[PDB]
Amino acid sequence: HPVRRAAVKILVHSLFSMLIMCTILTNCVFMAQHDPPPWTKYVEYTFTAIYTFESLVKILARGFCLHAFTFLRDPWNWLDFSVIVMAYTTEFVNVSALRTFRVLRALKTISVISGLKTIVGALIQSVKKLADVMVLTVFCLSVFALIGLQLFMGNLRHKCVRNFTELNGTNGLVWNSLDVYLNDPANYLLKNGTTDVLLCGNSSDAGTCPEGYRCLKAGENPDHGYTSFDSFAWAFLALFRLMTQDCWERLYQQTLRSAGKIYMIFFMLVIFLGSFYLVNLILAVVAMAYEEQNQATIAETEEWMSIKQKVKFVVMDPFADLTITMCIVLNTLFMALEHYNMTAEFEEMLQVGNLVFTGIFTAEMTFKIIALDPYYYFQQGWNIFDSIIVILSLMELGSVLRSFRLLRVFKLAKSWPTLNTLIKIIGNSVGALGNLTLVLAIIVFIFAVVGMQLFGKNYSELRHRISDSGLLPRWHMMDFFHAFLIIFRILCGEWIETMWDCMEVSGQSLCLLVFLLVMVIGNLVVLNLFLALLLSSFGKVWWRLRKTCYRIVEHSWFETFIIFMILLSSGALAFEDIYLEERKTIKVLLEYADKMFTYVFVLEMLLKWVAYGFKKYFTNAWCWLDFLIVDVSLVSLVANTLGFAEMGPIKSLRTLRALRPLRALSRFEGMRVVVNALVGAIPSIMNVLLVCLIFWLIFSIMGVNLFAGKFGRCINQTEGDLPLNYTIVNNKSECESFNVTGELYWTKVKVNFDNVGAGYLALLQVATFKGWMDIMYAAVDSRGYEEQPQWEDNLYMYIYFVVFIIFGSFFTLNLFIGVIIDNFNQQKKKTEEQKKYYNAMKKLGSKKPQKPIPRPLNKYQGFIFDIVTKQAFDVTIMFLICLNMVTMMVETDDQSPEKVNILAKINLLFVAIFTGECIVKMAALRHYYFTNSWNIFDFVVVILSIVGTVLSDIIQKYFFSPTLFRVIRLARIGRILRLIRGAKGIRTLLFALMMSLPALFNIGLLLFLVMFIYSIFGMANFAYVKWEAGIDDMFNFQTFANSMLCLFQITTSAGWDGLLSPILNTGPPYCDPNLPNSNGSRGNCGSPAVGILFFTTYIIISFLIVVNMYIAIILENF
Ligand SMILES: CCCNC[C@@H](O)COc1ccccc1C(=O)CCc1ccccc1
């Protein structure tokens, strides 16, 4: 047919493809709109027509029903098939939610662009290769969800309820008990500094409600209802949230607040294993799928002219590009000397300096135009780049626009190889890997418009249930930009806090579905891009005495003695909390112990000397460490007795006593090798930190140009939380004219962009996503210069942070991890009890045994033997234990008496089934319960089950203990762990985990030591800090246990902004200096210099230790 040939010619032709691509792109910019005008309706029709034409033009090219089979064989056209079907249905003949379907059109260009379909296809293999670790992750999450459910069932419903005294007449204190104390939130007491209920616990480790507030379980719900441990669904959600570490510290502090501080152990166990280990397993198998597919593709590929003479003679030898790099460095350094309150002459000086720098660059640019050839400038990319910045600078001479000089610092890339490694990464992100980035871009676009069509009217109408008062939420999906922002925040790792609000406004089923799909798919494709970037960038008495001391120092008892003194002295350090003032006996006890310690360590020093020699002593680095610390101690003692004591610097120098635990590093052959292999990689960390400091210098100068001085608030003193209305108070100066009453305080935000240093602090709080909320809120409210912030004026400043997060957090991370990996390779190329652990893992880890047991050949014995052996018996007892698991999942809080009756009956039924299996099994012939470790394991669990049943039988008659039940019942969890015998994936993964826990023990020991040093430092400084955002009555630095809680929390980087926040404040509107402090000190202030030092250094050292050591572990396992 002629129409057949015509349709085929249109099909193969390439102008049709670009026509449909432009049509899709315009339909995209038309989907991304909310509140479309009527002039859009025909446009809809328009698109419909074109797509239908596509359909015809292809099916008329097919021809028949066999051709229709071949056409539908490629699945991609099923999409626009459904698209035109839905179009005809909606245009011929409602819930109004069908409009959400045409976003499928946006996926069409993945099949139209022949490169994108390759990506979205090659991204399918890993998610079905993720199966083994996915079921291991679901299995561990469900195990720990049962554990957490049994431990904390209805614990999060504890509330510091007010005091209720019951009345005689029953059946403003007048009320009813339950209907008033369950649905009444008036009765509860809010947490200090929040509109959030206070939790409590009857235990002596939980929150202590103030006088006048008892503490019960009769409460509304958890925060919005979604953080319960009450059911297995809610508990599985809570443990998923703690696995992804999304706001996990909030659940940590809530649970410890109600359950007790000792359950801290639980949380660390679920972080040291749940978050870290399961997440890292998923990540490592994705990395393995990536390596495998890339090597698979690599294998598939393996299948007047006088004046010309004079000027060219003058420009023969420029030879001064080094002076140009120096002038660039001076230019950035000169731009960096910009701050908030600059004098007029200093501003004029900076302007003249950058003017003369522009002159320098313009002059040598026009010289380089005539130095070689304008075809040379047409040739090289660097020269094009400097030409661009010159034109942009002259445009400046003709807030965002001044910053384009900053790219000049990138000119250092030619001499700073790690900087050009960074730019190679950024050039692959949109170069050789442009398709991955483009796929991610259209996926974020699809998710943004899908979410906005699904949730726009919800977010817009029911906003009253999502914000404080008649006012907007900071995060929503009504506009496309805010939907993109929700998606981007999710990609950053914050999906629970906006999911709560979405489900509060929209609906749990659909919102859960979409946010979990966004998180899974987006984090998967972002990990794909991350890994792809990482892969694309790849007389004799004197001598007699000396040998006497040489004998006295090498004696093992001497070494154990000094180790014990080290440990005792550090433990003595731990006793230095705020309660020594009333501890009179142990005060002087610790005084004498301290002087004994310095004397014994200095005598040890002198004997080391006289034995080994001064050159043999002062060459060892750890001996230098010991000498330095004993020097600290000696000077402290000397100035303590020989006058000039409690004198400023000398009385604050004994704070350095907290370094005393560092003596332990040299002794233990685990910490020593760890610190060796760690400081052996400080040069790489230093050069990468230099590249990151230059990049964040760029971004901090941008933030100082954009909003420096625009972060002030002018809070009203009574309210305190929020700022003020622009209408009423507009300027900082009007904040000082209406200030006839001293309630107005023009405060900055704690972390702002006022210097390059405050810029660096804000960029660290944004790059870790802790504390960035207030940064970005004060930035997208930044109206004027000293002007009061309008609620979302300058809304597009979000872009700044987004861009920074992409270049300063994503790519720099690709830098960090990058060098680390390669660093280790070169170190790869160039505790004896743990060796015995190794040897025993070799010894008793016997895999294949001999013939286990022969048939007893008796009538009953042989029959029971034969019914025990067949694998059908194994699979059915596994089905039985899985049914026990499910009947374990059906337990909730405050369920009912009859249901718990039934559940206890089924409990006895199941322990009976399994103990019958046990009595049949040990009688296999004689030796079933001796050969395999699994049989004796289930033997232990079955006897534990029988003893648990009889303990449940003897609750009160013989002897009673209230809390122990909750843990003996927890032994039932052991039964589900019996499933580890059947599965092969999770068993091998958990065994390879248990093989490496000596290494994790050494790493956790170094981490514990760093926590100990920083706990003592914070006990010295950060006690008496005002109780604010992240420092409550339970997570302090007051005691040592509180310090360990705070520091374990921060070790995951979580909530570190909320703890640094009360260390920064220094003013009367927040602090109270001159406060009658109980100790020698005064004032409840933090000290910003050492607070920033402490927290930034602590999170950076913990990040470095964890990253370095975990990559070492992962490489040594590989
Ligand atoms: C993408 C992970 C999502 N969940 C974790 C994050 O939320 C924060 O985790 C951390 C908490 C404390 C210190 C460091 C980290 C890290 O990021 C290092 C992870 C890591 C693991 C193994 C090998 C290299 C690096």
Side-chain angles (χ1 to χ4, degrees), residues 2-8 10-20 22-66 68-85 87-90 92-161 163-183 185-287 289-297 299 304-347 349-364 366-367 369-464 466-558 560-595 597-615 617-639 641-643 645-718 720-725 727-733 735-827 829 831-846 849 852-920 922-924 926-927 929 931-959 961-1081 1083-1116 1118:
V3 296
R4 159 180 170 181
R5 311 302 179 97
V8 165
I10 287 292
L11 169 142
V12 53
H13 210 290
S14 64
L15 198 280
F16 202 45
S17 207
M18 277 218 208
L19 190 35
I20 296 207
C22 291
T23 326
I24 286 305
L25 269 44
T26 35
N27 176 240
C28 285
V29 313
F30 268 89
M31 285 182 319
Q33 316 284 139
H34 84 297
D35 192 0
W39 286 106
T40 313
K41 311 189 90 132
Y42 314 136
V43 195
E44 267 89 42
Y45 278 153
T46 318
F47 291 129
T48 323
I50 316 144
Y51 301 142
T52 41
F53 293 167
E54 172 45 277
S55 324
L56 318 165
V57 176
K58 187 145 21 183
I59 191 48
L60 299 198
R62 301 302 101 173
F64 289 101
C65 295
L66 200 279
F69 170 81
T70 58
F71 162 81
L72 288 179
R73 268 204 66 256
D74 289 345
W76 275 107
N77 45 29
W78 287 73
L79 307 177
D80 62 336
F81 216 59
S82 316
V83 169
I84 57 79
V85 179
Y88 214 94
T89 60
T90 193
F92 177 80
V93 286
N94 286 15
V95 70
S96 185
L98 293 324
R99 181 177 181 170
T100 310
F101 279 94
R102 292 173 296 180
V103 59
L104 299 156
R105 295 159 172 169
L107 300 83
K108 188 180 312 187
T109 39
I110 292 85
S111 199
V112 177
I113 304 181
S114 168
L116 299 210
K117 65 151 57 185
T118 305
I119 285 310
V120 192
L123 199 136
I124 288 321
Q125 277 313 324
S126 324
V127 305
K128 284 84 142 172
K129 186 185 143 48
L130 271 168
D132 188 317
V133 293
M134 213 63 209
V135 314
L136 188 147
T137 310
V138 177
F139 187 91
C140 294
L141 281 176
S142 178
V143 165
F144 273 89
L146 293 166
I147 288 176
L149 157 73
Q150 288 169 0
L151 285 174
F152 317 118
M153 207 147 54
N155 253 325
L156 268 72
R157 311 238 320 283
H158 292 349
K159 278 169 184 52
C160 286
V161 311
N163 233 11
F164 195 19
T165 60
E166 320 196 70
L167 273 65
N168 290 327
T170 185
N171 316 118
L173 199 274
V174 48
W175 266 324
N176 183 303
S177 153
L178 175 54
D179 62 53
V180 175
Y181 278 63
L182 183 162
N183 191 69
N187 307 343
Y188 312 170
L189 144 162
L190 314 166
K191 190 170 189 186
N192 250 353
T194 320
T195 72
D196 192 2
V197 293
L198 186 52
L199 302 180
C200 183
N202 280 340
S203 165
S204 77
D205 288 78
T208 51
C209 313
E211 208 296 291
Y213 281 78
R214 62 163 308 167
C215 55
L216 292 163
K217 192 158 146 296
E220 183 178 2
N221 262 343
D223 66 12
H224 261 160
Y226 310 113
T227 69
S228 277
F229 273 111
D230 302 329
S231 299
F232 176 84
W234 292 132
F236 194 93
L237 174 62
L239 275 66
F240 183 68
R241 148 198 198 182
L242 309 178
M243 187 251 289
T244 71
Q245 284 180 16
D246 187 7
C247 295
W248 81 270
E249 93 264 353
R250 187 179 170 77
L251 186 50
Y252 164 79
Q253 302 187 7
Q254 283 170 342
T255 308
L256 298 210
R257 188 50 147 253
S258 61
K261 295 183 197 172
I262 182 160
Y263 288 103
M264 184 258 207
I265 304 169
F266 169 78
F267 278 95
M268 82 165 42
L269 169 79
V270 63
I271 294 287
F272 269 21
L273 151 82
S275 191
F276 282 175
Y277 165 88
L278 310 165
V279 158
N280 192 297
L281 250 178
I282 294 184
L283 272 35
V285 307
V286 178
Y290 243 79
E291 208 70 271
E292 183 178 2
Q293 66 158 71
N294 296 25
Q295 299 202 169
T297 76
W304 200 357
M305 316 302 118
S306 323
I307 321 185
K308 159 197 300 194
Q309 293 177 335
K310 265 293 193 184
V311 300
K312 264 57 170 186
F313 271 150
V314 182
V315 308
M316 299 181 299
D317 316 295
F319 200 62
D321 288 1
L322 172 71
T323 82
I324 289 300
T325 79
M326 291 266 118
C327 86
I328 289 153
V329 171
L330 273 167
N331 188 19
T332 78
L333 207 73
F334 193 79
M335 219 169 170
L337 321 179
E338 190 190 338
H339 33 111
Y340 168 38
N341 254 325
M342 264 191 314
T343 55
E345 66 265 25
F346 198 52
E347 238 289 334
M349 201 272 289
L350 292 161
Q351 274 306 355
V352 168
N354 256 48
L355 177 63
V356 59
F357 274 110
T358 317
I360 293 169
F361 291 118
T362 38
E364 280 223 8
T366 175
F367 281 5
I369 305 167
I370 78 181
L372 317 94
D373 50 292
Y375 315 136
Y376 206 96
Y377 256 68
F378 175 64
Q379 171 43 26
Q380 276 290 70
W382 286 109
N383 295 255
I384 283 296
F385 162 58
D386 181 65
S387 324
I388 295 154
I389 59 96
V390 179
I391 297 306
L392 290 169
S393 53
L394 311 172
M395 177 39 168
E396 321 156 332
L397 311 148
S399 64
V400 199
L401 190 283
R402 291 181 292 160
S403 33
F404 285 174
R405 318 152 179 167
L406 290 178
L407 300 325
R408 285 193 284 224
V409 78
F410 268 109
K411 291 174 65 175
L412 316 174
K414 289 157 301 153
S415 35
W416 190 358
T418 59
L419 197 62
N420 72 50
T421 304
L422 177 63
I423 74 187
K424 279 166 45 188
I425 281 169
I426 305 182
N428 286 30
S429 178
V430 295
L433 261 42
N435 49 37
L436 275 66
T437 319
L438 183 61
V439 165
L440 170 57
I442 41 184
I443 272 181
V444 183
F445 173 78
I446 287 164
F447 280 137
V449 303
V450 159
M452 72 172 289
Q453 295 295 100
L454 280 171
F455 305 107
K457 317 189 303 193
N458 304 324
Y459 271 117
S460 182
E461 305 306 316
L462 295 162
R463 61 166 66 101
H464 66 269
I466 211 182
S467 285
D468 39 318
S469 62
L471 174 83
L472 275 313
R474 309 308 299 237
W475 304 79
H476 51 218
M477 275 174 148
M478 38 189 69
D479 318 345
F480 170 83
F481 187 45
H482 288 85
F484 166 69
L485 285 186
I486 288 278
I487 307 304
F488 178 63
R489 191 185 175 201
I490 285 181
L491 305 194
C492 288
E494 312 202 23
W495 52 270
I496 196 73
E497 198 172 0
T498 169
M499 188 203 283
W500 290 330
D501 285 353
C502 160
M503 302 190 314
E504 187 74 3
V505 83
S506 148
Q508 303 186 0
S509 64
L510 188 63
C511 182
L512 267 150
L513 154 74
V514 58
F515 275 79
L516 296 168
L517 250 173
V518 166
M519 181 209 328
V520 170
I521 282 294
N523 279 256
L524 153 81
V525 73
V526 168
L527 169 63
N528 282 248
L529 173 66
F530 197 102
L531 299 176
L533 280 176
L534 273 179
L535 266 307
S536 267
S537 295
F538 282 169
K540 217 188 193 182
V541 49
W542 185 258
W543 276 257
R544 204 220 62 83
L545 186 269
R546 286 186 55 184
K547 295 320 100 154
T548 327
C549 318
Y550 187 86
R551 183 174 301 178
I552 209 187
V553 298
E554 207 265 348
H555 197 201
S556 295
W557 295 118
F558 180 65
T560 76
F561 163 70
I562 62 156
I563 283 193
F564 264 68
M565 301 313 285
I566 292 176
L567 270 275
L568 176 61
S569 46
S570 323
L573 269 181
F575 273 86
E576 283 267 354
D577 69 338
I578 63 167
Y579 295 135
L580 266 203
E581 180 270 0
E582 183 178 2
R583 290 201 183 103
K584 289 307 182 302
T585 299
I586 205 142
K587 251 179 69 72
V588 296
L589 207 181
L590 293 175
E591 293 250 318
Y592 287 164
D594 188 350
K595 66 172 312 224
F597 284 141
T598 171
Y599 287 158
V600 62
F601 279 115
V602 70
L603 81 84
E604 183 280 335
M605 203 252 268
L606 314 192
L607 307 152
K608 292 282 301 180
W609 268 345
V610 308
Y612 284 60
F614 277 72
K615 183 178 179 180
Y617 180 83
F618 282 94
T619 48
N620 233 19
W622 291 95
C623 287
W624 251 103
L625 176 58
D626 291 319
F627 170 64
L628 290 171
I629 310 173
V630 81
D631 183 9
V632 174
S633 61
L634 295 174
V635 189
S636 178
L637 162 86
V638 156
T641 167
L642 177 63
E646 72 260 58
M647 183 215 59
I650 203 65
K651 183 190 183 69
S652 316
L653 171 73
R654 69 194 313 262
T655 295
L656 203 64
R657 191 178 41 179
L659 260 73
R660 187 182 291 163
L662 271 167
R663 298 192 172 114
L665 276 69
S666 178
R667 267 71 197 186
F668 300 141
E669 50 261 272
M671 295 174 182
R672 160 160 46 85
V673 76
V674 164
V675 162
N676 269 173
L678 177 63
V679 313
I682 194 90
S684 64
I685 296 170
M686 276 315 299
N687 66 31
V688 152
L689 185 69
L690 279 178
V691 190
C692 160
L693 284 200
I694 274 276
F695 218 88
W696 294 25
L697 179 62
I698 286 177
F699 271 106
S700 33
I701 295 169
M702 291 184 185
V704 175
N705 291 149
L706 286 166
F707 21 61
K710 319 173 174 294
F711 275 28
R713 310 319 250 184
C714 188
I715 79 178
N716 174 311
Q717 182 56 329
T718 68
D721 231 77
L722 285 27
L724 266 185
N725 209 37
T727 72
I728 155 201
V729 158
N730 164 47
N731 277 313
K732 170 182 178 174
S733 325
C735 185
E736 303 176 40
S737 295
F738 295 103
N739 198 1
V740 307
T741 59
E743 38 184 39
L744 286 312
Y745 292 78
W746 205 85
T747 79
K748 297 304 214 176
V749 316
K750 309 288 202 303
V751 196
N752 38 31
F753 294 84
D754 284 15
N755 324 129
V756 173
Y760 268 105
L761 188 58
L763 300 191
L764 195 47
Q765 276 202 359
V766 171
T768 59
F769 316 120
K770 270 80 207 184
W772 68 329
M773 279 298 112
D774 303 13
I775 321 284
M776 306 196 313
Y777 288 0
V780 315
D781 293 19
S782 64
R783 168 163 55 89
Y785 171 72
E786 281 162 354
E787 305 190 10
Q788 182 86 192
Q790 273 263 10
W791 194 85
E792 251 179 27
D793 181 65
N794 235 14
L795 188 147
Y796 292 85
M797 303 311 302
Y798 275 114
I799 299 165
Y800 167 57
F801 299 95
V802 181
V803 184
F804 160 55
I805 291 196
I806 294 185
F807 293 102
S809 293
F810 197 86
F811 293 123
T812 60
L813 177 63
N814 262 269
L815 200 58
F816 260 99
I817 317 297
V819 311
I820 289 184
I821 271 66
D822 276 9
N823 154 78
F824 276 78
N825 291 21
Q826 308 168 129
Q827 290 191 355
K829 183 178 179 180
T831 191
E832 293 177 350
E833 185 132 20
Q834 320 323 306
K835 293 179 179 179
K836 289 231 54 182
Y837 206 106
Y838 296 140
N839 192 31
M841 272 287 99
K842 269 117 182 66
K843 277 273 289 132
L844 285 83
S846 324
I853 280 201
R855 180 198 290 265
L857 262 303
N858 305 343
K859 184 273 136 174
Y860 62 104
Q861 288 291 105
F863 194 56
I864 63 101
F865 171 92
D866 183 75
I867 55 88
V868 154
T869 308
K870 324 174 225 78
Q871 204 132 288
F873 188 74
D874 210 77
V875 297
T876 174
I877 52 85
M878 183 176 282
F879 190 80
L880 259 285
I881 183 51
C882 296
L883 188 72
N884 182 29
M885 182 162 49
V886 186
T887 203
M888 201 172 310
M889 296 175 182
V890 199
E891 221 200 10
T892 89
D893 172 65
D894 263 347
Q895 30 192 359
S896 90
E898 183 178 2
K899 177 189 169 183
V900 69
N901 204 227
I902 302 177
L903 263 296
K905 299 286 295 180
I906 306 176
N907 194 300
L908 300 147
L909 177 63
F910 268 107
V911 54
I913 297 179
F914 296 134
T915 195
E917 183 280 335
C918 169
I919 57 85
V920 179
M922 44 191 159
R926 194 184 179 188
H927 298 152
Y929 272 15
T931 326
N932 294 340
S933 34
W934 281 114
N935 304 50
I936 31 179
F937 169 68
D938 64 63
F939 190 24
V940 183
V941 85
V942 76
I943 75 194
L944 254 173
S945 65
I946 311 177
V947 310
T949 38
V950 286
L951 294 212
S952 325
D953 277 36
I954 59 110
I955 305 300
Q956 306 290 337
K957 293 179 179 179
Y958 273 81
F959 41 84
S961 323
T963 309
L964 168 137
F965 194 102
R966 239 170 181 177
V967 175
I968 64 97
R969 189 179 195 86
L970 210 152
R972 294 212 308 255
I973 307 282
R975 292 188 225 153
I976 77 193
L977 273 65
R978 201 159 159 258
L979 286 170
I980 305 182
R981 181 179 64 195
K984 189 39 84 192
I986 176 180
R987 162 173 45 208
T988 62
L989 295 172
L990 281 180
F991 176 72
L993 156 70
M994 91 163 296
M995 233 195 299
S996 315
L997 38 77
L1000 296 116
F1001 174 72
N1002 279 340
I1003 294 153
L1005 212 58
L1006 183 66
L1007 228 42
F1008 165 80
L1009 195 32
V1010 175
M1011 292 181 60
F1012 192 68
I1013 299 179
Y1014 277 80
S1015 320
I1016 306 164
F1017 266 131
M1019 268 190 285
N1021 313 284
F1022 307 141
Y1024 304 111
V1025 155
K1026 186 182 182 187
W1027 276 355
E1028 243 189 339
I1031 291 185
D1032 48 339
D1033 54 325
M1034 181 161 315
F1035 303 85
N1036 296 293
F1037 290 97
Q1038 298 212 328
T1039 325
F1040 171 77
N1042 316 146
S1043 276
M1044 295 306 276
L1045 297 176
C1046 282
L1047 293 201
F1048 159 65
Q1049 172 190 344
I1050 289 179
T1051 303
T1052 71
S1053 181
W1056 82 273
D1057 74 274
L1059 288 140
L1060 176 66
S1061 190
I1063 320 298
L1064 296 188
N1065 71 333
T1066 45
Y1070 303 99
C1071 249
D1072 191 349
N1074 320 332
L1075 187 79
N1077 178 18
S1078 178
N1079 205 17
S1081 38
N1084 63 325
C1085 287
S1087 83
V1090 175
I1092 294 164
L1093 180 72
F1094 186 96
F1095 285 99
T1096 52
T1097 320
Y1098 180 59
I1099 73 160
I1100 287 179
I1101 289 179
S1102 52
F1103 172 82
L1104 285 177
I1105 288 187
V1106 183
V1107 164
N1108 218 275
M1109 291 308 148
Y1110 283 4
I1111 291 179
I1113 291 191
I1114 294 162
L1115 261 308
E1116 73 190 31
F1118 275 130

